[PDB]
Amino acid sequence: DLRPNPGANKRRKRVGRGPGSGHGKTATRGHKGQKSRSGGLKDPRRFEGGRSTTLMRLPKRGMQGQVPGEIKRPRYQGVNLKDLARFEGEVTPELLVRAGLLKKGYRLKILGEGEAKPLKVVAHAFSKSALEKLKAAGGEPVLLEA
Amino acid sequence: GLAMAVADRAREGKLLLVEAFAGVNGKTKEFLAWAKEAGLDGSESVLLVTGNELVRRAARNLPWVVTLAPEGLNVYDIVRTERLVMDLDAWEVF
Amino acid sequence: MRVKMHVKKGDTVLVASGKYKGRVGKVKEVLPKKYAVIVEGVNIVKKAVRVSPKYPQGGFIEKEAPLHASKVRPICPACGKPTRVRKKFLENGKKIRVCAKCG
Amino acid sequence: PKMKTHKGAKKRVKITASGKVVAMKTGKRHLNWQKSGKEIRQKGRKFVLAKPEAERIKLLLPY
RNA sequence: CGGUGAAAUUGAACUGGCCGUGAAGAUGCGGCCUACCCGUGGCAGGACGAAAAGACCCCGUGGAGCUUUACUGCAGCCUG
RNA sequence: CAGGCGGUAGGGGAGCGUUCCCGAUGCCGAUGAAGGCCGACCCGCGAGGGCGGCUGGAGGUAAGGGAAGUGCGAAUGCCG
RNA sequence: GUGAAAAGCUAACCGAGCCCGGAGAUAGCUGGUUCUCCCCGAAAUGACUUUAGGGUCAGCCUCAGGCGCUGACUGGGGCC
RNA sequence: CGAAGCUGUUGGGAAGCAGCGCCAGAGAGGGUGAAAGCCCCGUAGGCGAAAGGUGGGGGGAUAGGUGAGGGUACCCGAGUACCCCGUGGUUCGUGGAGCCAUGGGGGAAUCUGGGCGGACCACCGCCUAAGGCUAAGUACUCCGGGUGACCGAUAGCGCACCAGUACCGUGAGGGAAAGGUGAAAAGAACCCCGGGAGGGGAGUGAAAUAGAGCCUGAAACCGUGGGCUUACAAGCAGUCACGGCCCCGCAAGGGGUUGUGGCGUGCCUAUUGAAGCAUGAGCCGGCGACUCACGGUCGUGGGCGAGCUUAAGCCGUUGAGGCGGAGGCGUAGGGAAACCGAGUCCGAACAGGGCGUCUAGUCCGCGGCCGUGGACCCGAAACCGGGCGAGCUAGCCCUGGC
RNA sequence: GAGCCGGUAGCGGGCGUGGAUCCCUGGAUGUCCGAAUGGGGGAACCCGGCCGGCGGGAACGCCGGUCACCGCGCUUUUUGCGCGGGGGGAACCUGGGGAACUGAAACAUCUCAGUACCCAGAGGAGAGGAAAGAGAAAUCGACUCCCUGAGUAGCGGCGA
């Protein structure tokens, strides 16, 4: 093309800053009667509180904070139809998940809400909803067991 | 980017044999000899992609002009220029 | 930098860089590139001495360094100095030529 | 850099979808009242009406 | 009187006084009172004068020390 | 056309002045870049911008926007 | 460390020597700002703070989306 | 090794220009008497390195390492593990804390044996401690290089000038200032001032407001000398006003200054509260303070857009590129968890009750706004470590003296 | 390739067309100080055993010499070689020793930090290193550097 004064595309502003100056509002800060500007000025991460920040609470959810490990269990993955009633050819994960979108799921669970073409698709565990939408009006398979 | 850009830069006078001769493909002058026998002369600037060392180790000092070969893309400098030529649509990139 | 410029007298050749006319060589060093060959008229007024022709005020000179000259080869213009394969001297030589094997 | 979010806070609270700073409170911790009488029972969860904002943040990497 | 020639301090000035007024002890502000220009060598009354960023003092969840039957340990004595 | 307009901190609108980028194998440039002393015209509310004279002695960087160790009376600051 | 004793002396200063660095130690400690201009222009309060010339949330000054006659000021009208 | 015109007229001088001729896998850069491809040094490139010697790959490679199974049938890294205490490391500060080295005593066993899957028993799994050697892909800098939106000589490097010197110290220690005539010194000839010093002329000299604390040379501080002011006189002093009083415009006026009259409490930092003898203010110049990394997080032009985004490499990049899917947010929630589901959790509960749904999102630069960062600017007496330390003061210690 | 006498700079006198000027690689030189190492020794100043060599008588001084060093291997009993090695080096290694300020808006666990920093061998590298592994998977298959995992698990007056 050229360099036809290619400014910009409307809104941006590098709105830099600067040291001191005597123009407009330049020179000031905003505070006072509130000491806190230090060499390592607070930070400032939330800080303050001056009232434990209402942290008089306490934890009850006891099931973690143990030590070495956490809870180990193969993936837990359900679903919904109104996502890809589109293609099927053969509704089976990997072909999905492993494609389009969605991540790992050792054991397969299925639901959502919307409708679709009751066609057999991997089912390492499904919901009654689908049953009817894939029984006397559909197709469903079986799980792992290996 | 360059899509919409050159389109209008075609209203300028793009073209691009996609691969053209000139002669010894190693002797500068003669290359330009196809510059004139084509219709160009140092003024409105242009560029091009020649994936071959051939015209590279040739085009040497390409003022007002391109003299590429490999692939990096230099639209900008084309801004200060105009017309141009290509090495197969494939060379650009599928 | 480095020590690489010209050679010796013979004829060398004066030119017009603001002087004009052409003459033979004399002497030349490379360090700063300075040297001499008569022509260039410049006079360095001496000090309160006397031993020499007398007290102060100097005399004739020369002065230059970089490029700004040529060589001898009458009528037509001048060229360089090629090599040797099976001619005169072995496979060496070169003494400022016209464009054949002379000057 | 980095900012390794804080476990404890996360050991309890949660942002119910709506971005609401909601979680448990403090009270019926096994009576700590005594009096066979009656009351304790009362318990539940609650937002925060001005701090909540703040909190959610130190947990933008951990979720 | 010839000769050689600093200083700490260093906003700036064309710096009276009274009676009075303004952060409550002004030439610098009133109003009223005087005061031709530059000198010299004198007492410093003030110039809250210098230079010292109060050290008594209160200030710092600021500092250093000694010591107790503070609270915690090193010691080394001790005790199986 | 009603309106608004003092206004510390704060919080918006820009604009301005201030050093590298390509443009720079483009363009002024010794009938001068650059410093400047001067300017009592013009343009800028300002920011400044100019804009031309005399001293001035070797380079500059267009529109544009792209990057910012500056937009410094001072802190008994550093230094000279 | 020494110390015919104060707590003194140790490169004139010594209740803890100095070179050199561990760090901008640190720090609610003290002092700093230069372009133009242009819009609202508030707290010196409440709660809780080993908190009190510090701080959380609040409220009166900021910007944007949105809603909008309903708002601030007003007669009466119930009803305190 | 290399690549290819000049020319006159003017111009100090010509890298000024026209008319045009030119090599150009080579118009990088340094440059030679004023803004130079064809001009000194180079830059495509491809020649080749040694005698000296000399760092090693490829090649070859030498001594030094390389079959299978079947039953007999005894045999293998000890004060060693495993106990133990005090343990350190491990994210592991005692804790339900194994395993690593354990300092202390105990204290075996060697394959139908022996360690770990984090307590004591029982199933199952990969390994075999108490010998030591081991490249590659890893870090690094005084310089060599390059380059480097690297600084560009009150910089930067302390430092481009004979500094780690003058210097201050006792040691340790600590630390300065100080670049710039010019194209060429061509560096001043000569003769009257004359103490050498320091002068005037002249000359060179494109240039002596060009000559040696000389580049160009401002600013505080200097009066020659000029012009407007002044000895009745009261003031942050400057202003505004008619007036007069010397340059410039035919004119219109433009000026400079000031008489008097009026008018006048400054300035930078603090706070119910200022001008204020509450602080600071030598004076002029000159240096001076929140980026930015990374990290978090609201907006903005955007594109893709249930979909929307790949590090670390590898070819390649003058340059550039890049090819190169492991890593995110959503595409749901909610629930201690088990795990249920547009819905979840309490509850015996169809019910009650607080957290659910066209939730377009997503990554750019810019920016808010934060996290480490010292992240604004320097600074307070000290605490830690190591070095210097009694060529002074001490006490005794050796011996000379008075 | 035909200019040199370091630069700075001469008075003063000298070399290359048998080929200098100058960058070079092997190697002949190099006092005492310099771990310095016959010995002393506020280095850089200072006395020796012993053989041969000079002047010279012996000497004295001149010379050469050769003579600390420990250790493992060597070398019989004090015998003799060999190396190593003290010492050296901008970061980057290994190890052994190992703080306090600061945070925690006090403070004693915790923090900084195994950081600063001392001492320790070696290499350009170094350190490391080949499963008595990982871990759950009909599994993987030495060790080092980066990719994330993951700022997750967890550690924690579960406080920072």
XYZ file of N, CA and C (backbone and C1' of nucleotides) in Angstrom, chain G residues 1-4 8-11 14 16-27 29-34 44 64, chain H residues 170-174 269-270 289 374 376-395:
406
model
P 36.740 -9.844 77.051
O 38.093 -9.077 76.679
C 39.174 -9.742 76.024
C 40.215 -8.740 75.544
C 40.725 -7.722 76.567
O 41.699 -8.303 77.483
C 40.255 -6.604 74.530
P 41.531 -8.224 79.113
O 42.105 -6.767 79.520
C 43.435 -6.403 79.113
C 43.630 -4.915 79.174
C 43.268 -4.310 80.523
O 44.447 -4.220 81.369
C 42.045 -3.233 78.786
P 44.305 -3.989 82.973
O 43.428 -2.676 83.098
C 43.891 -1.415 82.661
C 42.766 -0.448 82.882
C 42.093 -0.721 84.225
O 42.762 -0.087 85.345
C 40.442 -0.582 82.518
P 43.345 -1.022 86.511
O 44.317 -0.084 87.368
C 43.920 1.229 87.718
C 43.948 1.396 89.218
C 43.484 2.757 89.716
O 42.033 2.836 89.869
C 45.525 2.115 90.787
P 31.836 6.767 79.534
O 33.429 6.654 79.702
C 34.182 7.700 80.324
C 35.661 7.330 80.414
C 36.372 6.963 79.120
O 36.757 8.136 78.397
C 37.023 5.480 80.831
P 37.137 8.019 76.827
O 38.308 6.922 76.795
C 39.679 7.273 77.052
C 40.626 6.300 76.366
C 40.311 6.004 74.895
O 40.773 7.040 73.991
C 40.718 3.965 76.040
P 40.247 7.057 72.472
O 40.732 5.609 71.945
C 42.143 5.242 71.944
C 42.414 3.787 71.534
C 41.763 3.296 70.256
O 42.269 3.860 69.067
C 41.731 1.570 71.838
P 41.268 3.924 67.816
O 41.929 5.016 66.843
C 42.120 6.374 67.264
C 42.966 7.137 66.259
C 42.396 7.177 64.840
O 41.738 8.410 64.618
C 44.622 6.330 64.825
P 34.178 10.954 73.037
O 34.041 9.451 72.460
C 34.371 8.362 73.321
C 33.845 7.020 72.832
C 33.821 5.939 73.912
O 32.718 6.138 74.838
C 34.595 5.036 71.854
P 26.728 1.927 72.877
O 27.884 2.410 71.875
C 28.404 1.537 70.855
C 29.644 0.810 71.354
C 30.189 -0.257 70.420
O 31.202 0.297 69.617
C 29.907 -1.169 72.601
P 31.655 -0.521 68.322
O 33.098 0.092 67.918
C 33.388 1.467 68.194
C 34.708 1.919 67.587
C 34.916 1.669 66.093
O 34.297 2.639 65.261
C 36.817 0.944 67.246
P 33.059 2.185 64.355
O 33.556 2.375 62.835
C 34.027 3.626 62.322
C 35.391 3.431 61.692
C 35.424 2.496 60.495
O 35.145 3.173 59.275
C 37.047 1.769 62.041
P 35.112 2.307 57.895
O 36.616 1.747 57.747
C 37.483 2.231 56.736
C 37.597 1.201 55.656
C 36.262 0.791 55.033
O 35.923 1.728 53.955
C 37.472 -1.139 55.738
P 34.476 1.755 53.199
O 34.315 0.247 52.689
C 35.207 -0.311 51.708
C 35.167 -1.822 51.769
C 33.771 -2.432 51.688
O 33.307 -2.511 50.344
C 34.967 -3.456 53.442
P 32.091 -1.565 49.855
O 30.767 -2.340 50.364
C 29.752 -2.817 49.469
C 29.462 -4.277 49.768
C 28.212 -4.597 50.591
O 27.010 -4.600 49.801
C 30.052 -5.803 51.483
P 25.622 -5.259 50.336
O 26.058 -6.677 50.936
C 25.864 -7.902 50.210
C 25.235 -8.932 51.115
C 23.807 -8.596 51.517
O 22.897 -9.203 50.631
C 25.080 -8.909 53.470
P 21.663 -8.335 50.102
O 22.340 -6.899 49.881
C 21.932 -6.060 48.810
C 20.995 -4.990 49.326
C 21.621 -3.753 49.962
O 21.941 -2.773 48.988
C 19.826 -4.559 51.285
P 22.137 -1.256 49.445
O 20.666 -0.581 49.273
C 20.469 0.852 49.175
C 18.989 1.240 49.117
C 18.060 0.534 50.096
O 18.020 1.290 51.290
C 17.001 0.719 47.925
P 18.987 0.891 52.509
O 18.250 -0.390 53.125
C 18.122 -1.625 52.412
C 17.508 -2.661 53.329
C 16.285 -2.140 54.049
O 15.168 -2.353 53.257
C 17.796 -2.969 55.666
P 14.603 -1.158 52.337
O 13.162 -0.924 52.975
C 12.517 -2.020 53.615
C 12.674 -1.907 55.108
C 12.095 -0.627 55.673
O 10.672 -0.720 55.805
C 14.237 -0.927 56.561
P 9.730 -0.234 54.592
O 8.522 0.574 55.279
C 8.207 0.394 56.655
C 8.750 1.559 57.459
C 8.613 2.899 56.766
O 7.344 3.416 57.048
C 10.787 2.693 57.744
P 5.115 8.892 58.152
O 6.504 8.486 58.868
C 6.806 8.946 60.219
C 8.205 9.571 60.347
C 8.615 10.589 59.279
O 7.951 11.868 59.431
C 10.395 9.074 59.575
P 6.901 12.322 58.285
O 7.612 13.578 57.577
C 8.058 14.708 58.317
C 9.491 15.031 57.951
C 9.750 15.266 56.468
O 9.323 16.556 56.047
C 11.421 13.847 57.319
P 8.028 16.679 55.103
O 8.510 17.551 53.841
C 9.188 18.799 54.009
C 10.509 18.807 53.250
C 10.405 18.645 51.739
O 10.087 19.847 51.036
C 11.932 17.061 52.519
P 9.127 19.735 49.747
O 9.965 18.839 48.691
C 11.103 19.376 47.979
C 11.300 18.737 46.601
C 10.185 18.938 45.568
O 10.357 20.139 44.811
C 10.807 16.658 45.656
P 9.070 21.037 44.497
O 8.595 20.513 43.065
C 9.318 20.860 41.881
C 8.882 19.993 40.710
C 7.493 20.261 40.127
O 7.516 21.303 39.119
C 7.877 17.908 40.394
P 6.428 21.310 37.920
O 6.076 22.863 37.650
C 7.081 23.874 37.411
C 7.922 23.531 36.202
C 7.155 22.993 35.004
O 6.850 24.069 34.115
C 9.098 21.650 35.492
P -16.746 15.956 57.607
O -15.195 16.222 57.989
C -14.433 15.221 58.668
C -13.032 15.702 58.997
C -12.892 16.743 60.097
O -12.905 16.135 61.365
C -11.502 17.307 58.286
P -18.505 9.782 31.106
O -18.870 8.222 30.991
C -18.138 7.372 30.087
C -18.583 5.920 30.179
C -20.053 5.641 29.906
O -20.436 5.697 28.545
C -19.463 4.462 31.804
P 47.107 7.823 58.892
O 47.750 6.739 57.913
C 48.954 6.078 58.246
C 48.683 4.638 58.635
C 47.841 3.810 57.675
O 48.593 3.331 56.547
C 47.170 3.390 59.899
P 47.816 2.906 55.186
O 47.156 1.475 55.497
C 48.001 0.395 55.855
C 47.236 -0.671 56.616
C 45.900 -1.074 56.036
O 46.109 -1.897 54.879
C 45.766 -0.961 58.445
P 45.999 -1.267 53.393
O 44.601 -1.897 52.933
C 44.357 -3.286 53.167
C 43.125 -3.525 54.017
C 41.890 -2.820 53.507
O 41.210 -3.599 52.516
C 42.244 -2.235 55.744
P 41.041 -3.005 51.015
O 40.341 -1.606 51.293
C 39.535 -1.480 52.447
C 39.428 -0.045 52.852
C 39.284 0.899 51.703
O 38.027 0.741 51.112
C 40.656 1.862 53.353
P 37.928 0.751 49.516
O 36.773 1.839 49.274
C 36.438 2.735 50.310
C 37.362 3.927 50.252
C 37.322 4.708 48.958
O 36.090 5.383 48.859
C 39.493 4.742 49.917
P 4.613 24.661 47.073
O 5.354 23.790 48.173
C 4.598 23.084 49.170
C 5.576 22.377 50.090
C 5.062 21.967 51.475
O 4.491 20.658 51.480
C 6.888 23.396 51.731
P 4.160 19.880 52.869
O 3.518 20.994 53.857
C 3.947 21.067 55.250
C 2.847 21.482 56.236
C 1.453 20.854 56.160
O 1.280 19.521 56.660
C 1.303 23.139 56.804
P 14.606 11.847 36.761
O 13.409 10.822 37.080
C 13.679 9.519 37.586
C 13.208 9.365 39.032
C 11.770 9.783 39.322
O 10.860 8.702 39.093
C 13.224 10.727 40.952
P 13.758 -6.551 45.798
O 13.019 -5.132 46.117
C 12.101 -4.939 47.243
C 11.933 -3.465 47.632
C 11.137 -2.630 46.630
O 9.831 -2.400 47.109
C 13.344 -1.862 46.724
P 5.760 1.408 44.216
O 6.602 2.691 43.793
C 7.744 3.073 44.534
C 8.780 3.700 43.627
C 9.903 4.435 44.347
O 11.009 3.581 44.641
C 8.896 5.897 42.793
P 12.235 4.109 45.558
O 13.134 4.971 44.541
C 12.607 6.120 43.891
C 13.580 7.268 43.952
C 14.168 7.448 45.322
O 15.236 6.552 45.449
C 13.357 9.534 44.574
P 15.279 5.578 46.727
O 16.535 6.174 47.533
C 17.808 6.308 46.876
C 18.686 7.315 47.582
C 18.624 7.234 49.090
O 19.309 6.117 49.636
C 18.323 9.452 48.511
P 18.687 5.372 50.926
O 19.236 6.271 52.140
C 20.352 7.130 51.934
C 20.360 8.199 52.981
C 19.786 7.731 54.308
O 20.713 6.962 55.091
C 18.715 9.712 53.698
P 20.165 5.928 56.202
O 19.468 6.895 57.265
C 20.037 8.176 57.534
C 19.943 8.523 59.000
C 20.382 7.408 59.929
O 21.801 7.426 60.096
C 18.263 8.205 60.595
P 22.618 6.047 60.069
O 22.837 5.766 61.634
C 23.617 6.659 62.471
C 23.305 6.467 63.965
C 23.484 5.065 64.534
O 24.840 4.855 64.924
C 21.391 5.986 65.273
P 25.517 3.393 64.758
O 25.053 2.602 66.052
C 25.101 1.193 66.064
C 23.692 0.652 66.051
C 23.547 -0.855 65.885
O 23.659 -1.489 67.179
C 22.078 0.268 64.408
P 24.588 -2.800 67.456
O 23.922 -3.964 66.529
C 22.686 -4.626 66.903
C 22.261 -5.706 65.909
C 23.296 -6.688 65.342
O 23.698 -7.740 66.252
C 21.905 -5.970 63.610
P 24.886 -8.789 65.846
O 24.672 -9.121 64.276
C 23.984 -10.316 63.851
C 24.538 -10.821 62.530
C 26.046 -10.832 62.369
O 26.702 -11.841 63.081
C 25.088 -10.087 60.368
P 28.308 -11.751 63.207
O 28.806 -11.992 61.714
C 28.565 -13.227 61.059
C 29.298 -13.225 59.755
C 30.742 -12.804 59.913
O 31.584 -13.838 60.454
C 29.804 -11.522 58.193
P 32.788 -13.469 61.489
O 34.038 -13.118 60.525
C 34.557 -14.105 59.594
C 34.868 -13.490 58.239
C 35.931 -12.410 58.237
O 37.246 -12.865 58.328
C 34.128 -11.506 57.223
P 38.264 -12.009 59.244
O 38.860 -10.887 58.266
C 39.854 -11.181 57.291
C 40.335 -9.885 56.702
C 40.955 -8.951 57.726
O 42.329 -9.262 57.996
C 39.274 -7.783 56.597
P 42.982 -8.891 59.431
O 43.215 -7.313 59.293
C 43.994 -6.784 58.221
C 43.706 -5.313 58.064
C 43.984 -4.490 59.311
O 45.311 -4.050 59.354
C 41.789 -4.114 58.675
P 46.440 -5.002 59.980
O 47.126 -4.110 61.114
C 46.679 -4.199 62.477
C 45.516 -3.246 62.718
C 45.280 -2.809 64.160
O 46.142 -1.754 64.487
C 43.225 -3.327 63.142
P 47.555 -2.093 65.138
O 47.427 -1.476 66.608
C 47.943 -0.191 66.946
C 48.256 -0.140 68.428
C 49.123 -1.287 68.941
O 50.516 -1.002 68.780
C 47.244 -0.973 70.348
P 51.296 -1.494 67.441
O 52.363 -0.307 67.108
C 51.937 1.101 67.075
C 53.007 2.083 66.563
C 52.545 3.566 66.501
O 53.021 4.380 67.624
C 53.719 2.900 64.489
P 52.423 4.245 69.129
O 51.131 5.206 69.145
C 51.257 6.611 69.425
C 50.036 7.156 70.166
C 49.752 6.542 71.530
O 50.514 7.195 72.540
C 47.729 6.721 70.278
P 50.734 6.462 73.952
O 49.250 6.320 74.541
C 48.692 7.319 75.397
C 47.305 6.900 75.832
C 47.237 5.675 76.729
O 47.596 5.903 78.105
C 45.617 5.478 75.041
P 48.328 4.710 78.933
O 47.565 3.375 78.440
C 46.185 3.120 78.774
C 45.993 1.682 79.201
C 47.162 1.106 79.982
O 47.023 1.506 81.344
C 46.411 -0.450 78.327
P 48.262 1.465 82.375
O 48.483 -0.112 82.575
C 47.452 -0.911 83.182
C 47.755 -2.392 83.077
C 49.230 -2.775 83.077
O 49.833 -2.784 84.368
C 48.103 -3.990 81.405
